[PDB]
Amino acid sequence: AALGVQSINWQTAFNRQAHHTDKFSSQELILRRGQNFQVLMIMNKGLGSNERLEFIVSTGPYPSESAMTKAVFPLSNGSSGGWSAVLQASNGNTLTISISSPASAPIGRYTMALQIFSQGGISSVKLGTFILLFNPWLNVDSVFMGNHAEREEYVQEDAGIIFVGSTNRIGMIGWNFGQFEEDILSICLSILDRSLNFRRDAATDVASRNDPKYVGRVLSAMINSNDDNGVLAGNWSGTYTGGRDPRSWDGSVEILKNWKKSGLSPVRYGQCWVFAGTLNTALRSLGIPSRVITNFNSAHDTDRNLSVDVYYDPMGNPLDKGSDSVWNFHVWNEGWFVRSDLGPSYGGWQVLDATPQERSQGVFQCGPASVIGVREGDVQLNFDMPFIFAEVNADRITWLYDNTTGKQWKNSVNSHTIGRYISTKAVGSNARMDVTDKYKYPEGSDQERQVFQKALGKLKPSIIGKLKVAGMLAVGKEVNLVLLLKNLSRDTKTVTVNMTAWTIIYNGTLVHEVWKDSATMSLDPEEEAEHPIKISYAQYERYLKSDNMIRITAVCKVPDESEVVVERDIILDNPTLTLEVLNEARVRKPVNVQMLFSNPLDEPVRDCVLMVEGSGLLLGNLKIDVPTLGPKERSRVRFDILPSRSGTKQLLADFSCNKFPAIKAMLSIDVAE
Amino acid sequence: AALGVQSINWQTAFNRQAHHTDKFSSQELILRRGQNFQVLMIMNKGLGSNERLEFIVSTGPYPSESAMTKAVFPLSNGSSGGWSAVLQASNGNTLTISISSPASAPIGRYTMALQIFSQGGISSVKLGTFILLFNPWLNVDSVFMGNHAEREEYVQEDAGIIFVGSTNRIGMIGWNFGQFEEDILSICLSILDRSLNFRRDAATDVASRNDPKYVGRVLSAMINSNDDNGVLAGNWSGTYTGGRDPRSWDGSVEILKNWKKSGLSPVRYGQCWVFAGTLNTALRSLGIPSRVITNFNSAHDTDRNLSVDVYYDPMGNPLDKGSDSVWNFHVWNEGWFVRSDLGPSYGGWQVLDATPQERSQGVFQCGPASVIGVREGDVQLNFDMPFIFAEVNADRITWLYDNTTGKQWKNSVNSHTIGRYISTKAVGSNARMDVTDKYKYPEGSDQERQVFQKALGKLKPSIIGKLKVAGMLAVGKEVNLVLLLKNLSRDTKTVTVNMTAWTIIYNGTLVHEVWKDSATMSLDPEEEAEHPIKISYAQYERYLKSDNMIRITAVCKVPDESEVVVERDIILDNPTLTLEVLNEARVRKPVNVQMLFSNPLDEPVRDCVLMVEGSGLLLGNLKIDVPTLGPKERSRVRFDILPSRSGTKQLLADFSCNKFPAIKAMLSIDVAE
Ligand SMILES: CCCCCCCCO[C@@H]1[C@@H](O)[C@H](O)[C@@H](CO)O[C@H]1O
Ligand SMILES: CCCCCCCCO[C@@H]1[C@@H](O)[C@H](O)[C@@H](CO)O[C@H]1O
Ligand SMILES: [Ca+2]
Ligand SMILES: [Ca+2]
Ligand SMILES: [Ca+2]
Ligand SMILES: [Ca+2]
Ligand SMILES: [Ca+2]
Ligand SMILES: [Ca+2]
Ligand SMILES: [Cl-]
Ligand SMILES: [Cl-]
């Protein structure tokens, strides 16, 4: 009887454990390239001296050996370095075989078949399928990350922290990456089979999947629905009808599953941190060490001159006049891998940004950009460095613009305001890790100025004032500020002060004027004076958005002297939302939790919805409808979670209502077992 | 100045599109009879009311008006049914003329001249030439085929399917008719100027080219080199030195062009499907709807008694005795046209056979034969009905013959074995369409025997055994069969079993004995016995031909009882050969393809040649030399094809080496615009 296969034991638990892929909820054989895995093949008879087994693996719709998307190798001792199979032992008709794959193999879904040469004939049968990912544990793999602690954080951690807020009050929201949640790995993999690149040339695309630079750039494009039926639809208008307020999301899970479930229609809506969290999930799921980065005072230089313009009118009104803009903050990602295309000094963290800001080669894609290169100003290197360098270190010019006279006139230039407190979650904790020094030389140093010039070269008053915050700033309470002015001349001066307050979106989008006022003051030499700014809840509540941001401006003028513009963006805190576990947490053991929220307003809050999730704590997202809550009353909502993986877990919740959209809350929980 | 032509616009693109002749690669004006075409004739002046224009068309070496091979008609309305010219419009000196031809005009190359009567004189000038073909679109043309799908398959399709194999397992080979390839039409037209009929009387020949029955019969003679320096030299010997193995060809293109390239020397070598594929090409190019028919168990009755004899000796050897013979299968063609010579009930499909088996009027020609007439047994009607009727319905007599005693004796008579699974490619797909019901009444039905007698009238054991296949049959593997015997007697019987195994050509030609064995058995009443028949690769490899067929025979004798003859022809499969395109296919876009072949033998295969072709995919035939391939090794050959016509195309390959002649592969490819 001709040689043949009766069955195959993939020893999935054993291999996935050794390959560090055991956390994915999938039942599939998930492996990482460049590392051996062992299988048991039960034949119908003993391997004959004149018989031969040839293993065949292939990925993509057009597998070919020349493209490395297909390999044929014989069961023969020794490793060719690339694909190979070694007969480790024979017991009866069972063959213990060790299979090896090259460190540079394309990632993705593969099929394995067995060609059998026996008795003057040939037979072929499919053995099965498996998934192959990047290997951060393998020294020769481009995504190699040697340190244990870092690799765990940047690859194995599914709970994260993204910094937000403003440079004056940095905050943070929890984010459920959930790369191990059911179907997430599958969906992230399917993204590559849906890109513009794949539709253009599937054979070439699949072959390029052995490159983190290529995979990274594709994802920075596919995470946004722009140009390719990607995942997230961006919206910075303040009005999110037809979707969800970008701030209500708590993780990447619901986003990706909704994308797939909707037949791949855009998920509405997202803003930069949503794009980043989702991209991070994809990157970590595929094996590319990655983290999320927050840059405050992030500039969008559409001019390629490393300079951005902001405008105000004589009355102190901020204007949306230039195509460029400065965001309170912008979030993006960094992937870890060598850069064979740039050289040995440019490996390490690489910037990747799925937020659609600047078109690259016609489409909304961004990165990878060597962070090391950005710091040195080597903006001629791929990819998108001019733009990225601009985000972290463009100069900022303030202009005065009077539409009535059509006259425009330069006021000042700030070369240190843009690119501050660049942050990312610390390894092993929620602390804030400041990586500003990695993106650029110190502000005020001759070096950052030399680099700026270098980068650009490649691409080409009596009155002083200050806005100070007085007392708590929280949605529901009145806003109290103080404009402090001082006369630094030896002559008494008369200053005319025009002020305004506008609610804004975090990127700078102006929503509405909520307050304005003018005043004239008499200041003797050295005299210091102050003008109080009071904005009631009744005045700002109507036009305040989930960003809880307000732009305060004061244009001060003295006869014969240029205007003095005093700026300040303030952020009002949301009332507190709390989560509490009512007992010890143990895996597979139900634990009661309760949400607490007190309405600080004189009116009730309605249409209250509580959204809860957390990988390893709850399967998917829990949605709970909470009844109208009277003024000064408290809502107590109880629900049960069911831990599934022991360790330090993160439970996140969002509480949205008519007067308070997207109030966030997070609770760390230690699950034992 | 006298009236004269300045230039003429044949509006080729427009007229060919209307005449359904736009697919031919030629630059010439190709038209179909009975349909008008439009030309623009720019004269040197206006057409005077006293001037006159006479058009003159002519075809052949002796253009004659009474023979319809020459026609003179005035530029005046009133379509005289046949040739005519109508002045549709006059703009400046440009005359828009519409020319009509008769539905019964002779096909072929025509010259068109113009006679001008101006200013009391006469001038004459040649306008140009055009090609005129049959018109299956014209209701009054004898080749008319009203159904769209059928006409598209039988006239416009250049990719085909020919069924082969045996009654025990019907296979199929792809064939590239290529009627639209460069020079093919021209060559097919030239065949008519090279026939015995043309050389005999060119004047009458060309005049007769208005008759599809005539054109059809001529081609059935000229496709074979016999008697007239025709195209193909047949060879059924198993040895093809000095030419190509009949099974290596993939189409009619290479064949016709070679015929022309060699100064009309015979192309070596062909067998029935090759003659048929080539004839089919000629028929379709000239405009005669046609398809290829495969008849299994095809009989060659040379005695005209509708009976064929097969002989075996006592030792179980098949013998080559008697003029007749029974082919495992035989291929031929059917053309579609009315039969004015036979009557209203005999139109439709007409048998045409270019394979030289039986001379007709001393020439190797065959048909047309009304298929409807064959079914009815109307064998007195032209042409060659006795022979064709016998091919599909002759009775088979099995004889025993011992040359040592010179004695011969009947063993059995079979009236159902001849003419089975008569098949043709389905319209629009590669499915097998069985047309047995068109050639004869049901085997076993009273009618079938009524017609058989009618046709002939116009011309004038205790042991039962079965041969069964044990395991797969493939060139390289051993052959395993079993002779199953059973004694149906009430008394114990002793049976002597003599067996043999002969490699054969598909037509019955005996090549060589590769195995023989004898055994005597004693079987009790109802007892069943089995005798194993095992033939190793070494035993048959030396005598197996490209046909890959072996004839197994068993003559069982019991004292006082007649011999029981058990027969079984088997087909060994060739090792697999596959083609795979590595991307989408689009017009003018080069796309890579890969050939996959694995050597199953313990020895290497040499002289490896890969032949590839396919209309609309490659211009002509691609020839690739493949390096020697060691045992158990795989050959990885890559090459590019260049789609030139959108639609479903057919790629064909032939891989020949010393140990494996003519391995076939076929791949359907969808070419986008
Ligand atoms: C120079 C004095 C002003 C700076 C510190 C003021 C004390 C508290 O700091 C305030 C916070 O309380 C406030 O909610 C946020 C939001 O924008 O802004 C900070 O500057
Ligand atoms: C009675 C035996 C026929 C029943 C089918 C048994 C399964 C395989 O059938 C065999 C094929 O494998 C073989 O290659 C061809 C060639 O002639 O002949 C068939 O009978
Ligand atoms: Ca996109
Ligand atoms: Ca700019
Ligand atoms: Ca700076
Ligand atoms: Ca001939
Ligand atoms: Ca006969
Ligand atoms: Ca019959
Ligand atoms: Cl998954
Ligand atoms: Cl031609």
Side-chain angles (χ1 to χ4, degrees):
Chain A
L3 182 57
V5 183
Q6 264 172 42
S7 62
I8 155 143
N9 188 315
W10 299 98
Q11 294 181 148
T12 303
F14 171 77
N15 293 306
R16 289 186 57 185
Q17 198 293 306
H19 283 234
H20 317 287
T21 56
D22 57 293
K23 305 226 293 173
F24 293 109
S25 55
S26 177
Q27 294 300 72
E28 294 179 277
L29 175 55
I30 306 173
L31 304 164
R32 296 183 189 287
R33 68 185 187 175
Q35 194 182 316
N36 307 325
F37 55 109
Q38 186 192 68
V39 305
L40 279 37
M41 220 170 306
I42 307 182
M43 309 306 282
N44 64 348
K45 56 181 283 294
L47 201 179
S49 63
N50 185 54
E51 294 175 309
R52 174 179 176 174
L53 303 178
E54 294 250 41
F55 292 80
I56 304 176
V57 297
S58 53
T59 181
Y62 304 113
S64 69
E65 308 200 21
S66 64
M68 310 293 110
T69 52
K70 177 185 183 177
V72 181
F73 47 106
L75 173 50
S76 180
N77 301 291
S79 63
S80 295
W83 290 95
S84 71
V86 182
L87 182 56
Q88 301 179 311
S90 297
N91 302 296
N93 305 315
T94 305
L95 310 173
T96 297
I97 298 170
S98 172
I99 296 178
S100 173
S101 74
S104 52
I107 65 163
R109 293 174 170 289
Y110 281 75
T111 291
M112 188 182 276
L114 187 64
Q115 204 183 207
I116 302 176
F117 292 74
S118 179
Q119 314 197 329
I122 304 178
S123 65
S124 178
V125 62
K126 179 180 174 178
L127 291 180
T129 65
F130 62 96
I131 291 171
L132 193 60
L133 307 170
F134 286 109
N135 201 339
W137 286 259
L138 215 202
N139 57 179
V140 299
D141 187 320
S142 59
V143 302
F144 179 66
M145 185 174 266
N147 179 270
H148 175 76
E150 292 168 54
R151 187 199 295 135
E152 288 296 305
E153 171 79 23
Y154 306 136
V155 179
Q156 309 300 58
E157 185 56 49
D158 53 349
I161 302 291
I162 301 175
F163 296 88
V164 297
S166 66
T167 80
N168 288 159
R169 194 179 188 66
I170 298 175
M172 62 159 75
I173 56 165
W175 191 270
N176 174 24
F177 296 128
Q179 59 257 45
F180 310 121
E181 296 317 279
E182 172 175 285
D183 217 22
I184 297 307
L185 179 56
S186 174
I187 295 172
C188 290
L189 283 164
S190 74
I191 287 182
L192 307 182
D193 302 313
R194 296 292 186 180
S195 66
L196 286 172
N197 315 62
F198 181 86
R199 282 178 262 169
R200 197 146 47 223
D201 188 341
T204 290
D205 175 76
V206 175
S208 298
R209 297 177 178 187
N210 71 313
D211 177 25
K213 306 185 300 300
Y214 181 83
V215 179
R217 191 167 172 73
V218 166
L219 292 177
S220 83
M222 279 302 284
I223 295 304
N224 64 61
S225 58
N226 307 69
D227 332 303
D228 50 25
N229 287 63
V231 184
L232 294 164
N235 187 163
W236 289 266
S237 74
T239 293
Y240 315 102
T241 308
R244 294 181 53 170
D245 184 328
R247 308 198 83 118
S248 57
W249 300 113
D250 284 319
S252 309
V253 184
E254 303 302 289
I255 291 172
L256 296 166
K257 288 192 172 184
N258 280 357
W259 183 61
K260 178 187 178 183
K261 177 180 62 183
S262 62
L264 302 189
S265 300
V267 175
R268 311 163 181 285
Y269 299 94
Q271 296 182 333
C272 66
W273 71 88
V274 184
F275 285 104
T278 304
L279 173 55
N280 215 234
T281 293
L283 290 172
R284 289 189 180 174
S285 72
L286 299 179
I288 296 172
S290 58
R291 54 181 187 181
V292 178
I293 303 292
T294 298
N295 177 44
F296 297 88
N297 287 1
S298 197
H300 180 183
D301 177 19
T302 66
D303 266 353
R304 309 261 303 180
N305 47 46
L306 309 188
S307 177
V308 291
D309 305 299
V310 295
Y311 298 75
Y312 295 84
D313 58 30
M315 280 307 277
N317 277 290
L319 303 173
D320 188 302
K321 179 171 175 55
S323 56
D324 292 342
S325 67
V326 180
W327 294 26
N328 292 322
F329 74 83
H330 173 47
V331 183
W332 63 72
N333 308 67
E334 296 187 340
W336 178 268
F337 45 81
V338 303
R339 292 300 300 272
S340 53
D341 65 320
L342 306 184
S345 70
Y346 299 87
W349 292 114
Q350 311 295 316
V351 178
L352 291 169
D353 196 341
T355 303
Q357 292 200 83
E358 187 61 36
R359 285 182 178 289
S360 181
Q361 305 186 306
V363 305
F364 287 102
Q365 56 186 330
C366 192
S370 180
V371 174
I372 289 175
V374 172
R375 182 167 181 281
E376 296 309 305
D378 301 320
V379 300
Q380 0 71 252
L381 309 175
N382 295 311
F383 295 74
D384 313 306
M385 291 184 90
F387 169 65
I388 299 177
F389 187 92
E391 302 181 273
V392 299
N393 204 37
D395 279 334
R396 180 175 177 291
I397 302 176
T398 299
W399 301 75
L400 256 302
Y401 174 76
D402 191 327
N403 183 67
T404 81
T405 71
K407 186 66 178 180
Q408 165 177 171
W409 64 102
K410 193 171 180 175
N411 173 77
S412 50
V413 189
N414 197 307
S415 57
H416 296 176
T417 185
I418 291 179
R420 304 181 60 191
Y421 305 127
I422 309 178
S423 314
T424 195
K425 174 185 179 302
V427 176
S429 75
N430 299 341
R432 192 181 70 75
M433 170 57 63
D434 192 297
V435 298
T436 306
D437 61 318
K438 294 294 186 168
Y439 277 87
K440 66 186 179 179
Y441 287 78
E443 286 306 323
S445 69
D446 301 322
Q447 300 85 308
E448 78 82 56
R449 203 75 313 215
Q450 297 171 65
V451 179
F452 185 89
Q453 188 173 62
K454 174 185 172 186
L456 187 52
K458 292 170 177 295
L459 297 175
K460 251 60 182 183
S462 287
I463 304 298
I464 50 170
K466 191 188 191 313
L467 282 165
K468 305 212 304 173
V469 173
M472 285 178 48
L473 287 182
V475 184
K477 298 174 64 60
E478 72 172 8
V479 163
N480 286 297
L481 304 154
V482 173
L483 176 60
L484 230 179
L485 286 308
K486 186 173 191 176
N487 184 187
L488 297 184
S489 73
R490 94 277 292 186
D491 282 347
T492 288
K493 292 283 187 167
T494 303
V495 54
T496 296
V497 184
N498 294 145
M499 310 161 265
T500 71
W502 282 71
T503 54
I504 61 171
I505 302 299
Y506 84 97
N507 63 153
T509 298
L510 300 172
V511 178
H512 203 289
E513 155 193 336
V514 294
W515 177 89
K516 68 181 184 188
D517 196 17
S518 287
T520 300
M521 290 184 272
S522 182
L523 297 176
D524 297 315
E526 234 56 46
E527 184 176 0
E528 298 187 5
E530 48 182 275
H531 177 281
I533 298 178
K534 177 186 298 303
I535 311 177
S536 78
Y537 169 67
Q539 290 169 302
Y540 71 64
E541 70 84 15
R542 177 125 50 202
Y543 301 102
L544 190 78
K545 296 301 172 181
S546 50
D547 309 79
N548 289 347
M549 294 295 298
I550 300 188
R551 181 114 77 200
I552 316 295
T553 312
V555 175
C556 317
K557 179 75 168 62
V558 150
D560 300 309
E561 277 183 51
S562 299
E563 291 72 27
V564 168
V565 191
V566 190
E567 307 160 283
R568 182 67 177 265
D569 267 18
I570 66 180
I571 179 179
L572 285 53
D573 300 317
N574 275 314
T576 303
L577 176 68
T578 311
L579 283 175
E580 291 174 342
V581 185
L582 268 22
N583 52 179
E584 198 173 63
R586 173 179 163 178
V587 71
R588 307 187 206 73
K589 235 60 183 179
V591 280
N592 192 188
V593 180
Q594 71 191 338
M595 173 240 83
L596 307 176
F597 174 73
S598 288
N599 187 10
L601 308 179
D602 290 342
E603 78 192 66
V605 291
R606 47 182 53 249
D607 306 312
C608 316
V609 181
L610 194 229
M611 300 289 246
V612 190
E613 64 177 286
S615 286
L617 295 171
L618 267 182
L619 293 185
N621 166 268
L622 188 66
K623 171 187 171 176
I624 299 174
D625 287 327
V626 185
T628 297
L629 184 62
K632 310 293 187 292
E633 298 184 28
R634 192 177 85 162
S635 170
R636 214 240 306 180
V637 179
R638 274 199 304 172
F639 58 87
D640 288 350
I641 59 181
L642 186 58
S644 56
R645 175 186 288 87
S646 66
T648 292
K649 315 312 301 193
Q650 185 183 77
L651 181 68
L652 301 175
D654 178 86
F655 182 78
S656 295
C657 64
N658 72 320
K659 307 307 288 182
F660 297 112
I663 299 175
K664 320 301 291 189
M666 77 170 98
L667 176 69
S668 175
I669 302 171
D670 294 315
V671 179
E673 214 78 7
Chain B
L3 179 54
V5 183
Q6 202 196 75
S7 70
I8 181 171
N9 184 320
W10 298 97
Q11 296 184 137
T12 309
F14 172 83
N15 292 307
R16 291 183 51 185
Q17 195 294 307
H19 287 233
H20 314 287
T21 65
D22 55 287
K23 298 221 288 172
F24 295 102
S25 68
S26 170
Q27 297 298 62
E28 298 174 278
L29 177 57
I30 309 171
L31 302 162
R32 298 184 184 283
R33 60 180 192 177
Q35 196 180 327
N36 58 202
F37 46 112
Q38 187 189 74
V39 301
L40 304 177
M41 210 165 298
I42 302 183
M43 310 301 275
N44 65 320
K45 56 182 280 297
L47 179 169
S49 65
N50 190 54
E51 302 176 309
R52 176 169 169 175
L53 298 185
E54 295 279 335
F55 286 82
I56 298 170
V57 291
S58 53
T59 188
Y62 301 102
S64 165
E65 297 89 311
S66 70
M68 311 290 138
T69 57
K70 180 192 185 183
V72 182
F73 44 108
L75 183 268
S76 177
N77 306 294
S79 61
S80 300
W83 295 93
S84 69
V86 178
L87 180 60
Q88 304 185 303
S90 297
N91 306 298
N93 303 326
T94 308
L95 308 172
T96 297
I97 298 174
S98 175
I99 303 180
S100 168
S101 67
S104 55
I107 62 162
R109 290 175 174 291
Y110 280 77
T111 296
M112 178 179 273
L114 180 78
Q115 191 172 51
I116 302 180
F117 292 77
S118 178
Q119 312 188 308
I122 303 174
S123 69
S124 192
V125 61
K126 179 182 171 185
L127 295 178
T129 65
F130 59 100
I131 295 174
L132 192 63
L133 314 171
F134 289 106
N135 199 342
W137 282 261
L138 216 217
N139 55 31
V140 294
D141 186 325
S142 62
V143 295
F144 177 64
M145 182 171 267
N147 178 275
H148 180 69
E150 291 169 60
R151 187 197 295 134
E152 291 293 308
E153 175 74 28
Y154 305 131
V155 175
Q156 307 295 62
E157 181 61 52
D158 52 356
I161 296 300
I162 299 181
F163 295 88
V164 299
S166 70
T167 61
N168 279 169
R169 66 150 32 188
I170 303 171
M172 67 182 256
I173 65 177
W175 191 267
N176 171 32
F177 297 130
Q179 63 260 39
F180 307 119
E181 300 314 289
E182 196 72 37
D183 220 22
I184 299 307
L185 174 59
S186 173
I187 295 173
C188 289
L189 286 172
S190 75
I191 290 175
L192 303 179
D193 302 314
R194 299 288 182 177
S195 68
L196 284 172
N197 319 65
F198 184 84
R199 285 173 263 176
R200 189 150 48 229
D201 188 342
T204 288
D205 178 75
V206 176
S208 300
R209 295 173 183 183
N210 69 331
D211 183 8
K213 297 184 290 72
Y214 182 76
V215 175
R217 187 164 177 71
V218 169
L219 290 170
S220 73
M222 283 299 286
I223 294 300
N224 60 58
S225 61
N226 304 261
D227 324 302
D228 51 36
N229 300 162
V231 187
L232 289 157
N235 187 156
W236 287 267
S237 75
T239 292
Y240 313 105
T241 312
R244 294 184 53 171
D245 185 317
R247 311 196 80 126
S248 62
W249 302 107
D250 287 316
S252 307
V253 173
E254 178 167 42
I255 288 176
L256 294 168
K257 296 196 172 188
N258 280 356
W259 179 62
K260 171 178 175 178
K261 179 176 63 181
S262 66
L264 305 190
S265 292
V267 182
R268 309 170 180 285
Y269 297 99
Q271 278 173 17
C272 70
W273 70 90
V274 188
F275 286 106
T278 301
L279 174 56
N280 207 236
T281 290
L283 290 175
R284 286 187 187 173
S285 66
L286 301 184
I288 294 173
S290 58
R291 57 186 185 177
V292 178
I293 306 299
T294 292
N295 177 46
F296 291 89
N297 286 13
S298 203
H300 180 179
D301 172 21
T302 65
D303 306 12
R304 300 190 54 176
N305 51 39
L306 307 181
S307 181
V308 285
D309 309 297
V310 172
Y311 297 87
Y312 295 92
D313 60 28
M315 278 307 271
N317 289 296
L319 302 173
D320 170 59
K321 191 173 193 299
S323 308
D324 302 0
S325 61
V326 173
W327 293 35
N328 271 293
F329 73 81
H330 175 43
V331 190
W332 62 72
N333 306 71
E334 297 191 339
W336 180 272
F337 47 78
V338 301
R339 291 298 297 275
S340 55
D341 57 326
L342 308 184
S345 65
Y346 301 100
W349 294 112
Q350 313 293 324
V351 179
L352 287 168
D353 196 342
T355 300
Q357 295 190 74
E358 184 70 34
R359 294 173 176 286
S360 173
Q361 292 180 293
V363 183
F364 276 113
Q365 63 191 323
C366 192
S370 173
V371 176
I372 278 163
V374 170
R375 189 172 199 274
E376 295 307 314
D378 298 318
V379 303
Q380 350 70 252
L381 304 171
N382 300 312
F383 294 77
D384 312 300
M385 297 206 74
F387 163 69
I388 303 175
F389 185 92
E391 293 182 285
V392 303
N393 206 56
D395 281 334
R396 167 173 165 152
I397 303 173
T398 300
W399 299 83
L400 253 297
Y401 175 85
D402 191 323
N403 191 58
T404 74
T405 66
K407 294 180 181 180
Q408 164 183 166
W409 61 101
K410 281 191 177 184
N411 175 72
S412 58
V413 181
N414 190 314
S415 66
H416 60 289
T417 188
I418 297 301
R420 304 180 57 195
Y421 307 130
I422 308 185
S423 313
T424 196
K425 173 183 178 299
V427 170
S429 72
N430 294 341
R432 185 169 69 70
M433 175 61 240
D434 187 301
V435 297
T436 312
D437 57 313
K438 297 298 181 171
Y439 279 89
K440 62 184 175 183
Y441 288 75
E443 289 295 350
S445 73
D446 261 299
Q447 298 70 56
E448 102 87 356
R449 296 317 292 172
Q450 294 185 62
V451 178
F452 184 89
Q453 308 286 55
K454 171 184 172 180
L456 184 61
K458 303 202 173 196
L459 294 175
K460 250 58 186 175
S462 308
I463 303 300
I464 57 172
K466 180 184 175 187
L467 280 166
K468 299 204 299 180
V469 177
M472 74 163 56
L473 297 172
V475 186
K477 301 173 69 67
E478 66 178 357
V479 168
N480 285 294
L481 301 155
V482 174
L483 174 62
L484 195 179
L485 300 179
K486 184 174 182 177
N487 176 33
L488 306 178
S489 178
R490 53 177 285 184
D491 289 336
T492 300
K493 299 301 169 63
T494 293
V495 59
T496 292
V497 180
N498 300 317
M499 309 157 272
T500 68
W502 282 76
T503 54
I504 62 174
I505 304 297
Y506 83 95
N507 65 157
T509 299
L510 296 171
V511 185
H512 199 276
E513 162 198 326
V514 296
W515 178 91
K516 70 177 184 186
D517 197 18
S518 294
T520 294
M521 284 176 253
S522 184
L523 293 171
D524 293 314
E526 236 53 65
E527 181 175 1
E528 303 192 8
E530 300 191 359
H531 186 279
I533 295 185
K534 184 185 300 297
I535 313 174
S536 73
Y537 172 65
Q539 282 177 290
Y540 74 73
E541 73 76 17
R542 189 182 299 292
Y543 308 96
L544 186 74
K545 298 303 171 181
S546 49
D547 299 271
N548 289 323
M549 290 187 83
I550 311 179
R551 171 107 85 214
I552 313 297
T553 308
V555 178
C556 314
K557 183 67 169 71
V558 167
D560 288 346
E561 283 171 41
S562 295
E563 295 86 339
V564 181
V565 179
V566 191
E567 309 158 298
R568 180 54 170 285
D569 283 343
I570 59 170
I571 311 181
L572 279 56
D573 300 323
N574 277 316
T576 309
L577 171 67
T578 62
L579 293 180
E580 291 187 353
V581 184
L582 287 325
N583 212 301
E584 288 184 348
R586 299 193 188 188
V587 179
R588 311 194 200 71
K589 194 183 191 309
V591 60
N592 201 216
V593 184
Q594 52 177 36
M595 173 224 99
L596 306 171
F597 173 81
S598 277
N599 182 15
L601 308 184
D602 293 336
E603 63 187 68
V605 294
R606 316 166 172 292
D607 313 313
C608 311
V609 182
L610 203 235
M611 299 294 267
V612 191
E613 70 181 279
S615 292
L617 300 180
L618 280 163
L619 287 183
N621 163 272
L622 193 68
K623 181 178 178 176
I624 309 174
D625 280 332
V626 180
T628 295
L629 189 60
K632 307 301 190 303
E633 307 189 10
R634 68 269 173 47
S635 174
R636 239 261 304 184
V637 180
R638 277 195 305 150
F639 62 82
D640 288 345
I641 61 176
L642 182 53
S644 61
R645 198 194 303 280
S646 60
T648 294
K649 315 306 288 182
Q650 179 177 81
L651 187 63
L652 302 171
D654 175 88
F655 183 72
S656 290
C657 61
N658 73 319
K659 306 307 298 182
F660 300 104
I663 296 182
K664 321 300 297 185
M666 162 182 33
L667 180 66
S668 185
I669 305 171
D670 290 303
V671 180
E673 207 69 67

